[PDB]
Amino acid sequence: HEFVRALIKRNCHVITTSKGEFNMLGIHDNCAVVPTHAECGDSVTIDGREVRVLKQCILTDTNDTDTEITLLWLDQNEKFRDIRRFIPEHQREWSNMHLATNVTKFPMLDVEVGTVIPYGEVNLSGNPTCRLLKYNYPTKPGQCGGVIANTGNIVAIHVGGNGRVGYGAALLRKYFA
Incomplete structure (x- = not known):
């Protein structure tokens, strides 16, 4: 509410990729979640600025099936x-x-x-x-x-x-x- x-x-922040605009949800520290099909690259546009992705984790179940959740660890000073x-x-x-x-x-x-x-x-x-x-x-x-x-x-x-x-x-x- x-x-x-x-x-x-x-x-939350606006993430822009070639797949369009998505909502990005910060979770903790410099780690955010984005939909896997946003196809984020090694740097991502967040609120209109390029942010370097230190590490990307495409989450899967124990049978390697996509969850559609990707974790981004971002090169930023801010902590979610x-x-x-x-x-x-x-x-x-x-x-x-x-x-x-x-x-x-x-x-x-x-x-x-x-x-x-x-x-x-x-x-x-x-x-x-x-x-x-x-x-x-x-x-x-x-x-x-x-x-x-x-x-x-x-x-x-x-x-x-x-x-x-x-x-x-x-x-x-x-x-x-």
Whole structure:
């Protein structure tokens, strides 16, 4: 609510790649999360400036299936507010979740997507993607990277949809240990 808006303002940035504009969610220290299909390079445009990526980790499950989550370790002095304590340890169903992003098409957007349910593996644009949470909301192109959350629970980043539902990549605390 207030929590989600403060999260966007404090930890989120516009990342621009050849795939367009995405929301980038800082997690802790210099480590941020972006959708894997943003295809970030060795340096990324953040809030209109080139930022060098010290290390990139494309996260996979134990069968090497994409989670659609990529970790960026950024060459910056700033430290993200450590939000790991709000990131769940396991996949679970959540009620009254919001999608929030800040992007040219969707500036300071916050919308209620409702209930978020663990949904498993889905092929997104031909690529198998695991550990997705699904919400019955007609999410739109340009909302990728948006945060799926509510007060105290930071649960996914938005990574796809089909015009009727949205798929979020589950954020799990062990990713960020």
